[PDB]
Design a protein around this ligand. Structure first.
Ligand SMILES: C=C/C=C\[C@H](C)[C@@H]1OC(=O)/C=C\C=C\[C@@H](C)[C@@H](O)C[C@H](O)/C=C\[C@H](C)[C@H](O)[C@@H](C)C[C@@H](C)CC[C@@H](O)[C@@H]1C
Ligand SMILES: Nc1nc2c(ncn2[C@@H]2O[C@H](COP(=O)(O)OP(=O)(O)OP(=O)(O)O)[C@@H](O)[C@H]2O)c(=O)[nH]1
Ligand SMILES: Nc1ncnc2c1ncn2[C@@H]1O[C@H](COP(=O)(O)OP(=O)(O)CP(=O)(O)O)[C@@H](O)[C@H]1O
Ligand SMILES: Nc1nc2c(ncn2[C@@H]2O[C@H](COP(=O)(O)OP(=O)(O)O)[C@@H](O)[C@H]2O)c(=O)[nH]1
Ligand SMILES: [Ca+2]
Ligand SMILES: [Ca+2]
Ligand SMILES: [Mg+2]
Ligand SMILES: [Mg+2]
Lengths: 427, 435, 54, 326
């Protein structure tokens, strides 16, 4: 039943904060944790993400982690910052210098027992814990390095619980430092081994959606994070509203243990040019949802094949019309679904739409196209590593080169794995 | 002679709910358990007492156990209209479910809850002066419905070796399922359960879904729609045990009348008529009998014309007299394609119960003056094993999703052993049925 | 045709229409399987915890 | 748009129907094992009928009637005609035939043979790997499942040349079980000597070709010959009888094979084989469930299949068929 939420580092806490703003709103929980909604449906499954405090106050089951205090302070000051349990902010002062070795081995080690203490206290009060969800980036140092350290320690203490992540991948187009390929390649290694489902959110795709479709000339991290929180709200609707526990979702979405990296999508994506108020029809939602221009990993689905596809519709709309359009698109893209997993496209509907939208759709795909994202990281990693460029920041934290080689070798193996299943047929 | 019902997993529990609700309507049992026509208080051994015992305050209590590895579906029972009917011991819930993983339902969680279930079943058995056996309701595709049910049936053969066990099993349909692993769970549970079931009635959700769209004109049926229709079929199949009658009045007669070969123990059910309550033209005995040979009215879509009948049984409810049945049988046999195996007699066992079908007030099914459920053991139902077996073969050739089962302590070899058992099942049907 | 075995109860009747004549594992073994499964799960867990300790 | 798959890489005819579908820009071919198809151009043998009609949201059509072998197996055709109430007494257009295994009619065969030789009547039979012979023992030593059929000793001989022949007619049965007889038939032709060459008219048992191109003669000419040679027409002297035989055979099995009210739908193209004796009487020889076509006719007939059987169910955005009624 219950999920424990962790958010780590700058990117993780900023996206994490918006996610809680959004879904708190959807559940009628105001910024002080008081409920003021109008439907039993909002409270039916409220404990999945919220603990109940005396006086019908709802407190997010959220742990906030970081190695410098800046972003934590900004959250407490943000809209719903009062909503978070004060004891659940865990943070240091050194920072991680955008450096995976510092997040994972030197600065992070110091702080990790304190995070595990808060996790234990939240777990112990769970009637029956489903699992954990972590939001973080892979290009920085705290989200990437400490985040994957956290997942390793959680798995050791809770080996039989589900571990899912929303993981922002780096891209040169929206880049903070040149070492990002190193931090992400070291993290994918961990994720391959220790998560059950990872939602890959590529900052390049986020940017391009804001630029090309939303017609936003100069997007901000605020913009990107709004897209991500709407997508996070969509994928978790089946957990927060009547309809699906984490394990049953992973069993039906993950056909091989290592290929559990998903491509999310959202619709509608429209320009606010006196179109925003136009009622959107079920055809429009469904065509967008499967369009490349709508997917948040910079991967061409037409370049690979889908293993599984979950599509979630929100709002009041014809359930009949929904099936008609989901079937229509499978006939269109018949080529893009493997034929050896019968009935691998599945649909859910939920009547509670997001704030401000009569209907919406979220797409969750396990596509071999994702291999393109990993091979891009691999290419960037290799360009630097072959010259040992910027390696001294990591070897100076006690890491050896051999750990970089293993991580690179592990990701390339992953890429070849996607390639095998893309070419596999029922013949 | 008592019957104990066992409802396993979400599909079994919710179908069990629709059935017991219907029973109460049919027998005149109020939601609070009281039965005004039952003039023997706290006792008696009438026909309906095969499904209900009686408290001293006059309550009529189903002879039922509800088990689910997750509590939210059984909480419905605890809070429904007929909550006042059951007591806590009859409701057994775990904390977390099998996640559509047969291995998790059978090995990991099954091992831990089976003795409690058997203990609760034992507590009903000890209330029975002459226990007949068990009716077991479950889905093929659920981790619990598939995985725990096969564990339970093994153990029931151990504990009640001389008792009959019948199955009502929901066969998986993509129209109303979100899972992709149900072909695995389906084969795994059929292989392990086969030696332990005397007679299994499969309902294909696809068929129920399509009968609800077409006959009741429901754009998108819900489980509630599907379960009300299923409970009509269950009720007419079990009415012989619950009402004064002569045909199929004890569980062993089901095997005797429908199952010459132990492994071929899956009769095809066909029901008629299904009529939208919003409508109507009232069909004849010949017409509804003719409807029983329409693939569109079957609980599993398949084509009986291209198989062989081994046995065939007609259950009528309502305004039906024998002369009507015989004239209707005579006519249809000159028109339709019907070929029995040469080593069986070409004939029908007919039962008429004069009480017309009962419906849930305010439900989608119209009250009709007569209806019929045909139970026929056709080799044509082998089509459904072939469909299921082929989906299994497609995923299994790439070992897709196998790691989830192995990770729960199952051996990869069990997939093969189960699959090869199904291959033999298909071979058995072909031998019986083809020239 | 031939109609046989006509039983007339008060709740209806029953009869047969003929149209043409013709021409286990013990409890211990179950236990072994379940405990076997348990041990394979426990072995797999121990490898995991050993691997994490490394 | 519509989707179909191809699973008989040897279908002369449906290779052309497949190419036409593609030319319409509104059909696309998925790999042979993709389950989400509207049309299956299926395999001659073991076609997985029981997996058709269970794909959500998909109307599925196939080009074979499950159960139609009852008419297209030479052994099965005989048992059907003999034991079908609809044809048993009524069948005066099928040669006396017997089933014989190496439910068997060995004893009955000998009974009519004795009548024949004893009465000194024509007593030449053809078992079918064929063998035409007049002594009953010479035939059976060859069979040790075949059928033994009375060989038509007085066939209508084309002149000049004194040549045997047979008539192929193409029949399309759509999903609604309308019976469409293709306007065009072919004769396949041999001099007859009362040496298996002038006795077997198969296009392979001949391949020669001086009288007509490819030993095949079409209806335009065969009609003119009947007019010139015998003062009758193809329609009056033969085609009425052909239409009656097609209707009898196909209406007989309709309850066993019709796909109306079934969860998937069938159509099928048939080739009936006929003989004409010298009293202008027509005789059904066999029924082929997987026929090729006359090279000249592939174009027109394959377009008729698409028009009448395929597009009739999956519509796109005069008549070559005679409709045989009910
Ligand atoms: C810039 C376009 C704004 C609105 C559109 C007309 C449309 O909604 C609509 O037609 C109508 C209503 C949307 C209501 C919600 C969702 C609200 O969060 C929108 C937010 O205030 C607007 C913009 C934020 C601050 C980000 O810059 C943006 C990137 C978030 C992202 C979810 C928008 C996708 C659109 O397709 C959206 C759903
Ligand atoms: N007809 C019908 N089918 C149902 C119902 N509930 C679930 N199903 C079907 O049953 C299958 C899912 O299995 P469930 O019964 O939900 O699973 P379970 O036995 O509860 O086991 P777990 O949830 O995995 O622990 C799918 O094929 C569903 O379509 C129901 O109430 N009626
Ligand atoms: N009863 C009969 N009397 C006279 N000729 C006959 C006959 N039965 C068969 N034949 C001749 O033998 C030839 C082959 O017959 P049949 O059709 O039974 O064999 P087959 O199926 O191998 C060839 P196809 O499939 O092309 O028609 C026919 O073309 C016909 O001329
Ligand atoms: N979408 C998004 N990406 C971010 C945000 N903040 C940082 N990033 C990206 O995350 C990576 C840097 O990681 P960061 O979270 O800042 O480092 P950390 O604090 O040590 O975990 C780079 O890929 C940045 O583009 C944010 O708020 N939104
Ligand atoms: Ca009583
Ligand atoms: Ca032939
Ligand atoms: Mg930063
Ligand atoms: Mg369940």
């Amino acid at each position: 039943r219950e999920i424990v939420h962790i958010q780590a580092g700058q990117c993780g806490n900023q996206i994490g904060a918006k996610f809680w703003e959004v879904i708190s709103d959807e559940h009628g929980i105001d910024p002080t944790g008081s409920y003021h909604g109008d439907s039993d449906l909002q409270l039916e499954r409220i404990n999945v993400y919220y603990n109940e405090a005396t006086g019908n106050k709802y407190v997010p089951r959220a742990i906030l982690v970081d190695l410098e205090p800046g972003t934590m302070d900004s959250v407490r000051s943000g809209p719903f910052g009062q909503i978070f349990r004060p004891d659940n902010f865990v943070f240091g002062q050194s920072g991680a210098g955008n450096n995976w070795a510092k997040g994972h081995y030197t600065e992070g080690a110091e702080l990790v027992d304190s995070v595990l203490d808060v996790v234990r206290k939240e777990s112990e009060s769970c009637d029956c814990l489903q699992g954990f969800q972590l939001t973080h980036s892979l290009g920085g140092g705290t989200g990437s390095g400490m985040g994957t350290l956290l997942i390793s320690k959680i798995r050791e203490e809770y080996p039989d619980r589900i571990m899912n992540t929303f993981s922002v991948m780096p891209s040169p187009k929206v880049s903070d430092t040149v070492v990002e390929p190193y931090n992400a390649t070291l993290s994918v290694h961990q994720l391959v081994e220790n998560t059950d489902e990872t939602y890959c959110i590529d900052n390049e795709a986020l940017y391009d959606i804001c630029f090309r479709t939303l017609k936003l000339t100069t997007p901000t991290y605020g913009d990107l994070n709004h897209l991500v929180s709407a997508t996070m709200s969509g994928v978790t609707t089946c957990l927060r509203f009547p309809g699906a526990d984490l394990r049953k979702l992973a069993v039906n979405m993950v056909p091989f243990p290592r290929l559990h990296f998903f491509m999310p999508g959202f619709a509608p994506l429209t320009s606010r040019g006196s179109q925003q108020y136009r009622a959107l029809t079920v055809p429009e939602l469904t065509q967008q949802m499967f369009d490349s221009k709508n997917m948040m990993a910079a991967c061409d689905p037409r370049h690979g094949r889908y293993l599984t596809v979950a599509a979630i519709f929100r709002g009041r709309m014809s359930m009949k019309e929904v099936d008609e359009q989901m079937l229509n698109v499978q006939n269109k893209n018949s080529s893009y679904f493997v034929e050896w997993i019968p009935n691998n496209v599945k649909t859910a509907v939920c009547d509670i739409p997001p704030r401000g939208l009569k209907m919406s759709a979220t797409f969750i795909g396990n596509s071999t196209a994702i291999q393109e994202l990993f091979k891009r990281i691999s290419e960037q990693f290799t360009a630097m590593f072959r010259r040992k460029a910027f390696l001294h920041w990591y070897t100076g934290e006690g890491m050896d080169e051999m750990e970089f080689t293993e991580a690179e070798s592990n990701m390339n193996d992953l890429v070849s794995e996607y390639q095998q299943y893309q070419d596999a047929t029922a013949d | 002679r008592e019957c104990i019902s066992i409802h396993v997993g979400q599909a079994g529990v919710q179908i069990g709910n629709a059935c017991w609700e219907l029973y109460c309507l049919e027998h005149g049992i109020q939601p609070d358990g009281q039965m005004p026509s039952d003039k023997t208080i706290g006792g008696g051994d009438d026909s309906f007492n095969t499904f209900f015992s009686e408290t001293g305050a006059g309550k009529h209590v189903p002879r039922a156990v509800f088990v689910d590895l997750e509590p939210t579906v059984i909480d419905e029972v605890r809070t429904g209209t007929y909550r006042q009917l059951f007591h806590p011991e009859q409701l057994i819930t775990g904390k977390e479910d099998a996640a559509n993983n047969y291995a998790r339902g059978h090995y990991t969680i099954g091992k831990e809850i089976i003795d409690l279930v058997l203990d609760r079943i034992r507590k009903l058995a000890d209330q029975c002066t002459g226990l007949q056996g068990f009716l077991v309701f479950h889905s093929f595709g659920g981790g619990t419905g598939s995985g725990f049910t096969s564990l339970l049936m093994e153990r029931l053969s151990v504990d009640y070796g001389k008792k009959s066990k019948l199955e009502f099993s929901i066969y998986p349909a993509p129209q109303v399922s979100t899972a992709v692993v149900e072909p695995y769970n389906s084969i795994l549970t059929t292989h392990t359960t086969l030696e332990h079931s005397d007679c299994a009635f499969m309902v294909d959700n696809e068929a129920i879904y399509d009968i609800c769209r077409r006959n009741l004109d429901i754009e998108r049926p819900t489980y509630t729609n599907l379960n009300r229709l299923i409970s009509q079929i269950v009720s007419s199949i079990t009415a012989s045990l619950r009402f004064d009658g002569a045909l199929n009045v004890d569980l062993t007669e089901f095997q005797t009348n429908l199952v010459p070969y132990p492994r071929i123990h899956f009769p095809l059910a066909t029901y008629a008529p299904v009529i939208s309550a919003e409508k109507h033209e009232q069909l004849s005995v010949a017409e509804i009998t003719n409807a029983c040979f329409e693939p569109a009215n079957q609980m599993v879509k398949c084509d009986p014309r291209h198989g062989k009948y081994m046995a065939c049984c007609l259950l009528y409810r309502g305004d039906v007299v024998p002369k009507d049945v015989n004239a209707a049988i005579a006519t249809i046999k000159t028109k339709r394609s019907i070929q029995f195996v040469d080593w069986c007699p070409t004939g029908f066992k007919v039962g008429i119960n004069y009480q017309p079908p009962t419906v849930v007030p305010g439900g989608d099914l119209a009250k009709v003056q007569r209806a019929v459920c045909m139970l026929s053991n056709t080799t044509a139902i082998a089509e459904a094993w072939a469909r299921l077996d082929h989906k299994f073969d497609l995923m299994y050739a790439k070992r897709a999703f196998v790691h989830w089962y192995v990770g729960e302590g199952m051996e990869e070899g069990e997939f093969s052993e189960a699959r090869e058992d199904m291959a033999a099942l298909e071979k058995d049907y072909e031998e019986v049925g083809v020239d | 045709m031939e109609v046989i075995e006509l039983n007339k109860c008060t709740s209806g009747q029953s009869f047969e229409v003929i149209l043409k004549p013709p021409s286990d594992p013990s409890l211990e073994e179950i236990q072994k399987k379940l405990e076997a499964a348990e041990e394979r799960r426990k072995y797999q867990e121990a490898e995991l915890l050993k691997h994490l300790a490394e | 748009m519509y989707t179909f798959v191809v699973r008989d890489e040897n279908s002369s005819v449906y290779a052309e129907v497949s190419r036409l579908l593609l030319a319409t820009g509104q059909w696309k071919r998925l790999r042979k094992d993709n389950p989400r198809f509207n049309l299956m151009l299926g395999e001659r043998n073991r076609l997985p009928f029981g997996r058709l009609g269970h794909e959500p949201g998909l109307v599925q059509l196939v080009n074979y009637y499950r159960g139609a072998d009852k008419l297209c197996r030479k052994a099965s055709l005989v048992k059907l005609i003999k034991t079908s109430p609809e044809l048993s007494e009524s069948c005066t257009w099928f040669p006396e035939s017997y089933v014989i295994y190496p439910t068997d009619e060995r004893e009955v065969f000998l009974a009519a043979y004795n009548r024949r030789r004893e009465g000194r009547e024509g007593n030449v039979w053809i078992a079918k790997g064929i063998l035409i012979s007049s002594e009953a023992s010479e035939l059976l030593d060859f069979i040790d499942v075949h059928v033994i059929q009375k060989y038509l000793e007085k066939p209508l001989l084309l002149e000049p040349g004194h040549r045997k022949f047979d008539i192929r007619s193409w029949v399309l049965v759509d999903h609604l079980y309308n019976i469409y007889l293709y306007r065009e038939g072919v004769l396949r032709t041999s001099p007859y000597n009362s040496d298996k060459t002038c006795h077997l008219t198969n296009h392979c048992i001949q391949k020669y070709g001086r009288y007509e191109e490819g030993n095949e003669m079409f209806f335009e000419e065969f009609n003119q010959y009947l007019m010139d040679a015998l003062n009758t027409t193809l329609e009056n002297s033969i085609l009425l009888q052909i239409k009656h035989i097609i209707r009898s055979c196909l209406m007989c099995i309709e309850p066993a094979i019709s796909t109306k009210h079934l969860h998937y739908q069938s159509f099928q193209l048939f080739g009936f084989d006929f003989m004409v004796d010298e009293e202008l009487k027509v005789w059904l020889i066999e029924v082929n469930g997987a026929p090729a076509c006359a090279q000249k006719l592939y174009a027109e007939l394959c377009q008729g299949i698409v028009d009448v059987a395929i597009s009739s169910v999956f519509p796109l955005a005069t008549s070559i068929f005679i409709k045989l009624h009910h």
